Amino acid sequence: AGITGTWYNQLGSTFIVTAGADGALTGTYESAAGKAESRYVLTGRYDSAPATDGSGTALGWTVAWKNNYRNAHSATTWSGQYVGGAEARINTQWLLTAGATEANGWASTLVGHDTFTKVKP
Amino acid sequence: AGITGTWYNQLGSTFIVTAGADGALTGTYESAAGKAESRYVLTGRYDSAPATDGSGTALGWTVAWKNNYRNAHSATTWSGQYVGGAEARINTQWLLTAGATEANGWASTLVGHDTFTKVKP
Amino acid sequence: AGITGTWYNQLGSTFIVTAGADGALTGTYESAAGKAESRYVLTGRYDSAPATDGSGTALGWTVAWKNNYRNAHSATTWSGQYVGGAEARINTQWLLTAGATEANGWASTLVGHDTFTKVKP
Amino acid sequence: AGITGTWYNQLGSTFIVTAGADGALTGTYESAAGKAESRYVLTGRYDSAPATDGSGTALGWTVAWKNNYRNAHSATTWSGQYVGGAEARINTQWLLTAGATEANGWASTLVGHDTFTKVKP
Ligand SMILES: O=C(CCCC[C@@H]1SC[C@@H]2NC(=O)N[C@@H]21)NC1CCN(c2ccncc2)CC1
Ligand SMILES: O=C(CCCC[C@@H]1SC[C@@H]2NC(=O)N[C@@H]21)NC1CCN(c2ccncc2)CC1
Ligand SMILES: O=C(CCCC[C@@H]1SC[C@@H]2NC(=O)N[C@@H]21)NC1CCN(c2ccncc2)CC1
Ligand SMILES: O=C(CCCC[C@@H]1SC[C@@H]2NC(=O)N[C@@H]21)NC1CCN(c2ccncc2)CC1
């Protein structure tokens, strides 16, 4: 609950998601940063029966950075939680892995953090 | 290509995945570690047109740790790449976020790394 | 340059550091969160000849969470960069590893992100 | 205890460290990968009174990638634990931050994992 809809991160990226009744996330992602253009498919999962003690709702999703316009040979996963209320948020940390040869595998993965809100910066 | 099927990590967990023609990952995950029992739904994405220079194929997927037997109020995302050949591998790093109150949010996310192979340890 | 002094993160923790001329960081850390009390020794390194193109200055430091009052059998490393100017910042991501047995090693490491400023929240 | 000496990771890098009696780590690092040449100064911290229940000993250290031969405008922190015994190990995860402009800050940090042993691969 509260997850379905449009979310914006601190970079200005747009996350459009539908949370299905038994834990599915499905939607599109449009990144304001990096080797990206237009919308990309996403899919993920969320806890559809979270705790009732004030804790957030755990979730995650993946984008592979290939669409009809661009292929960046990479994929990002966001892991985080939804925190409801008047200033609802999805707080995440992410891992972006790029395809790499063996010699470059050590340097294949970026890490960061995105904060999503219902009204953009 | 090469991704569909069963994979095993260094903990003995079992990852069963179908890679669809236009980038979908769908399947089940059974963890040998942590607050888990039996299979959980997963979904993710992969680069369906990887580079041809020897690089791996970028991918990611998510498990929310709720099924009919157990809810651990948490979700893991694996970000990594498939590397084909006689000793094929999926090399990943992962983020596990647990639902948390505001006071505990700083401590909500574990990080680690899993190596998947087609024949178990 | 610009690094020496007192910094505060979003949790209210206090980072007191001296940046030595050839790349040393030395000081104390006081955490507002977790299994911590009073000051802990830190040491780290920074790039003492950063780029002049507007890029930040790369750095990192470590705290082991043992002092005369408390031992949390753990250590945090912060990796990030100093960004100078009127609203100077040290932007970091961190890894906290706790001592663990073999069975619990997979769950030994937390990840997060701290933003330090010269005037507290 | 057991930490002082020379360690080798899976890339063939050489970590030479002295663990001082009250928690200091001091030494040199020579990387077999990336924008590195010869030895770099490191400093870090470790838990000098670990648990006695079979748990490892938490530690961390930092290298800034500047020496007399090369400056890669970046720093790596390793966070992990020492596990003693006949096949002693230091198991780590690391964060490498590169100096970045504001527009590139999102992409400033790599993550990975290194396993150190007392006899090289
Ligand atoms: O730029 C993209 C694709 C778009 C990513 C957008 C990112 S997702 C997390 C963050 N939040 C957003 O909203 N937007 C950004 N992909 C690159 C990254 C850099 N690459 C490498 C290669 C080798 N090693 C490391 C990195 C090459 C591929
Ligand atoms: O144990 C699980 C669910 C099963 C995870 C299994 C993990 S997935 C990555 C790794 N690879 C595998 O194959 N198996 C393991 N969930 C916990 C974790 C610890 N928890 C917290 C709470 C607060 N902060 C931090 C952590 C509570 C919830
Ligand atoms: O709480 C502390 C020591 C203080 C850490 C303070 C942290 S440093 C990053 C952040 N920024 C700050 O300013 N303050 C916080 N240590 C614990 C953590 C949880 N622990 C485990 C055990 C097993 N697996 C995972 C985690 C047990 C030991
Ligand atoms: O290559 C180095 C310095 C040597 C690092 C060696 C690494 S330490 C962890 C691992 N374990 C080892 O033993 N060896 C390797 N530095 C780069 C990295 C890539 N860079 C960027 C820039 C912008 N964003 C992301 C990354 C530019 C600077």
Residue numbers in the entry:
A (entry chain A), B (entry chain A), C (entry chain A), D (entry chain A): 15 to 135
Can you provide the manuscript's text about this entry?
We describe here the use of an artificial cofactor employing the well‐known biotin‐streptavidin system to catalyze a Baylis‐Hillman reaction. As protein host, we chose streptavidin, as it can be easily crystallized and thereby supports the design process. There are several examples using streptavidin as the host for these cofactors, since its natural ligand biotin binds strongly (K d∼10−15 M) and is easy to modify with catalysts at the carboxylic acid group. No enzyme is known to naturally catalyze the Baylis‐Hillman reaction, a very versatile and atom‐economic C−C bond forming reaction for the production of various functionalized compounds and intermediates of active pharmaceutical ingredients (APIs).
We chose a derivative of DMAP as the artificial cofactor due to its low steric demand, which will facilitate its inclusion into the protein scaffold. The protein host around the cofactor was rationally designed on the basis of high‐resolution crystal structures obtained after each variation of the amino acid sequence. The location of the catalyst is in a shallow cavity at the surface of the protein. The system was evolved through repeated cycles of mutagenesis, activity tests, and structure determination. According to the presented structures and calculations the catalytically active site is too shallow to undergo interactions with 1.
